[PDB]
Amino acid sequence: SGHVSFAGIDYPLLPLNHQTPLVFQWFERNPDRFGQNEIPIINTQKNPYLNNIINAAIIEKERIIGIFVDGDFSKGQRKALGKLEQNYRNIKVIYNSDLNYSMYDKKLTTIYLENITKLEAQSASERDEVLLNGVKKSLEDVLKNNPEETLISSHNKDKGHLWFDFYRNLFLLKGSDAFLEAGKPGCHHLQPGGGCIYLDADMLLTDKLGTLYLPDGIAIHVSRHVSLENGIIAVNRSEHPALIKGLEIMHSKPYGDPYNDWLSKGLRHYFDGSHIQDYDAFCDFIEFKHENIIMNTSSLTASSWR
Ligand SMILES: O=c1ccn([C@@H]2O[C@H](COP(=O)(O)OP(=O)(O)O)[C@@H](O)[C@H]2O)c(=O)[nH]1
Ligand SMILES: [Mn+2]
Ligand SMILES: [Mn+2]
């Protein structure tokens, strides 16, 4: 089939051709735990993530593989990453510090003040006073600590998994163009404004992915308890409107979460804005399926961070 229907609208299954890059992510809070000529990506028995990425790059010889990284790497570590690129010619290491996200950012004071205004406009007998008090307290804390704090500066390495989760969605807004923005060589056959297939490093490829066909060019991982998840996110284009929708939630909500609000609500509110379908049906509609991936293998060994 070439179309699917959800919540009463028809969506074509759009192709992600075999060009579309795969993108893995490694944000490393403590790069000093690696040797200074060591690639600073976890590669232990239980979390053999660098090996997994390499095996994927070997399988997908013909496709660009991004490794989207962040952390205070040494010069030695940057050189070992360069060397990985020399060794597997399809691997492109993208440093988060080389990308500009200011077009997606918002100040926290701004967000807090907009919410406080809105709540204070509601009657005392109508409104959520606990939230109003909590937002006021968060505003007081930001003004004391760093008035210029933004969404993006706030989702930093001291925030655990929120660091990588937040910047993963930002990367997906940029799509393939991020390779070019970061100055990576040999990326000029990527489609301008094109997409990417983001995978957690424990999503093991056992053969070639081929061409994918996704509804409105987007799909994400579903775990089965059935939940949306962020460990696979595929888009066929930059600034996918469903992801822009979720960013709008992040810009409006105090305490927006990259998984629960940006990804999960953004996509659901985009595709089922009136909430006429079951969360489970949405999951079936959006699910990224592929027989040549063994999904979320950390769940059968151990999480690399939980
Ligand atoms: O220190 C960390 C730990 C995890 N991750 C990212 O989080 C993903 C998921 O990690 P894992 O599968 O270990 O976590 P879980 O399945 O428990 O969410 C990894 O592939 C990385 O992209 C990261 O960037 N830095
Ligand atoms: Mn259910
Ligand atoms: Mn996992």
Residue numbers in the entry: 40 to 263, 267 to 348
From the paper:
The non-LEE encoded effector protein B (NleB) has GT activity and inhibits NF-κB activation by transferring N-acetyl glucosamine (GlcNAc) to host death domain-containing proteins and to glyceraldehyde 3-phosphate dehydrogenase (GAPDH). The glycosylation target is an arginine residue, which was unexpected because the guanidine group of arginine is nucleophilically poor at physiological pH. The T3SS effectors SseK1 and SseK2 from Salmonella typhimurium SL1344 are NleB orthologs that behave as NleB1-like GTs, although they differ in protein substrate specificity. Here, by using a combination of X-ray crystallography, STD-NMR, enzyme kinetics, molecular dynamics simulations, and in vivo experiments, we show that these enzymes are GT-A fold retaining GTs that most likely follow an SNi mechanism.
SseK2 was solved both in its unliganded form and in complex with UDP and UDP-GlcNAc. Therefore, the electron density map for this domain was not resolved. However, in the structures with UDP and UDP-GlcNAc, the substrate leads to an unambiguous electron density map for the C-terminal lid domain, implying that the domain is well ordered only in the presence of the nucleotide (detailed information is described below). To obtain insight into the importance of these residues in substrate recognition, we conducted in-silico docking of the acceptor Arg to the SseK2-UDP crystal structure. It was observed that a closed conformation of SseK2 structure possesses a putative acceptor substrate binding site pocket that is connected to the anomeric carbon of GlcNAc. As a result, the negatively charged pocket of the concave active site interacts with the positively charged guanidine group. In particular, Glu271, the β-phosphate of UDP, and His260 were located in a position suitable for hydrogen bonding. In the docking structure of SseK2, a single negatively charged residue (Glu271SseK2) and an additional β-phosphate from UDP are in close contact to the guanidinium group of the acceptor Arg. In addition, His260SseK2 is located near the guanidinium group of the acceptor Arg.
